[PDB]
Design a protein around this ligand. Structure first.
Ligand SMILES: CC(=O)N1CC[C@@H](C(=O)Nc2cncc3ccccc23)c2cc(Cl)ccc21
Ligand SMILES: CC(=O)N1CC[C@@H](C(=O)Nc2cncc3ccccc23)c2cc(Cl)ccc21
Ligand SMILES: [Cl-]
Ligand SMILES: [Cl-]
Lengths: 305, 301
């Protein structure tokens, strides 16, 4: 019993974290095989960030300008190239702790674990979701750039995020491991703002199924609804639309609990129009949307890595 | 900016997780140097579980009855001994991935990371507090016994918890790494119940300071309170009493934010009286008590 916000075991990723220094800027790099990936803004000073020409800045750099440190060992940079907003530093040594890995781009609503690092040293691990406005509500201080988000599938690490910046509202923005930003963000010192966030509906339903599996049933009702009537109500409360794919993905939890997805949507519809009325669900007074249906199945069934 | 429930990186502990099998029972062990630590209830035949005599059961066991598996390698048990509710299986191989470590017993209110495991394989990592009633509100299934709680403050792993059992209310009980249970619990199937839980007041105050550091100020008020008046109100909401030690520990956050501890205590009294009125503090509609003053300073700097 119990339900916790749970991250993947971070060990396979800790063995990849390195410190990357370029001039006065120090941030984190991800060392996989003989390449170190890091945000390209490491090559920028305070003025450069205002309006940077990264191709122009990178051409002026030499391999010896990048100081890569893996533990107490300095790695020697033998090449440098840029892929979108990520810098790739070729090193002479392949990381012996390189796990089986893939670079994957995730969709909004998908969750991942963040290994927050400072000076190439892992300091914490937390579970979060890619918000529908493409930001992440992370916990990051100065020096956390280059920290990565990942999932684990069997024995393979799927790297899905690299931290680049913090928006004025305290939310965070970054890229996939190919340097493509999630969201309409740029890696510049300019006025940027996240769009109005919405609730990840399929995740709320998955979390309501986890609450039922844990014995919390007060919100269940006799009612069902159509996907169309639910979506009309949900859109009014700034909830993301629920697609037939989402209904299908919730199938196993629906079968395990005996509550159909449209039956659970009728519970969710009431929860929105009436509130919790002093009650909680899994110790929470708000509907939690950072657990995907797969996260719920993994936790409520004990999948190991 | 931002505030998250954050666990320590679990790598140093993953390299220590092994599977321990004794008869039909399989659970997790912690492999440090040439010793594997695990709950002593692994030697019980479920029929012994109501009133087990563990000294009697352990004396009947031989080293070849314990099957220890580290990854795909079977370790050879060359000795067995018991320290309180923990079984120590001496193995013929020192764990090469043994980190710098210590065994620490924690107090209620303290937080730690849990590496939940099944069959010696880590499946997830999360953050807990030792509740004032000495239970932990974990997420554990059958087979999670032997999963450990830890803190990793600078290079060294401090092991503070080993999971032993789930109480009838879904909460969890376990021991320190010396086998001493936290709380009035025993490793028997006898009727056991956790005491009524209370809120860790010092942690709520620390979290209110984290919210102020993050720009949340709506709950602040012009009032202050005596420590005794605060405890009288707090006890009525099933909040733990706040001692002078707790006031002292909140000193650095008080200095950083410019809000005296008793000034923040008056905000907390108002929050308990009115509720949040549709507002959230750090994205939460409830007062969070699983961040210690030390966690807040470490996370916020
Ligand atoms: C203004 C500026 O030049 N910066 C700052 C450094 C950097 C940045 O956002 N860093 C931070 C990341 N994560 C949490 C942070 C909490 C506090 C401070 C900084 C954090 C950055 C990166 C880009 Cl791509 C664009 C702009 C900026
Ligand atoms: C009742 C009983 O004989 N058991 C069960 C096995 C075991 C126990 O609590 N196991 C579990 C742990 N953590 C979550 C669990 C969720 C579901 C099931 C079992 C879980 C145990 C350990 C002791 Cl020390 C005393 C009693 C018992
Ligand atoms: Cl999803
Ligand atoms: Cl402040």
């Amino acid at each position: 019993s119990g339900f916790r916000k749970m991250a993947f075991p971070s060990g396979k990723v800790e063995g990849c974290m390195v410190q990357v220094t370029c001039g006065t800027t120090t941030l984190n790099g991800l060392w996989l095989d003989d390449v170190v990936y890091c945000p390209r803004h490491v090559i920028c000073t305070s003025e450069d960030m205002l309006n940077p020409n990264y191709e122009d800045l990178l051409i002026r750099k030499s391999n010896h300008n990048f100081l890569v440190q893996a533990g107490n060992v300095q790695l020697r940079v033998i090449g440098h190239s840029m892929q979108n907003c990520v810098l790739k530093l070729k090193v002479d040594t392949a990381n012996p702790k390189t796990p089986k890995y893939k670079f994957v781009r995730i969709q909004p609503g998908q969750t991942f674990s963040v290994l927050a690092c400072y000076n190439g040293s892992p300091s914490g691990v937390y579970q979060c979701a890619m918000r529908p406005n493409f930001t992440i509500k992370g916990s990051f201080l100065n020096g956390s750039c280059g920290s990565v988000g990942f999932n684990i599938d069997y024995d393979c690490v799927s790297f899905c995020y690299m931290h680049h910046m913090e928006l004025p509202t305290g939310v965070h923005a970054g890229t996939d491991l190919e340097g493509n930003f999630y969201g309409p963000f740029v890696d510049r010192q300019t006025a940027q703002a996240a769009g109005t966030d919405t609730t990840i509906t399929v995740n709320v339903l998955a979390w309501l199924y986890a609450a039922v599996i844990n014995g919390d049933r007060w919100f269940l009702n006799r009612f069902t609804t159509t996907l169309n009537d639910f979506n009309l109500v949900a859109m009014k409360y700034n909830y993301e639309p629920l697609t037939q794919d989402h209904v299908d993905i919730l199938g196993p939890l629906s079968a395990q609990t005996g509550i159909a997805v449209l039956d659970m949507c009728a519970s969710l519809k009431e929860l929105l129009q009436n509130g919790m009325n002093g009650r909680t669900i899994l110790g929470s007074a708000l509907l939690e949307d950072e657990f995907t249906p797969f996260d719920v199945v993994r936790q409520c069934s004990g999948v190991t890595f």
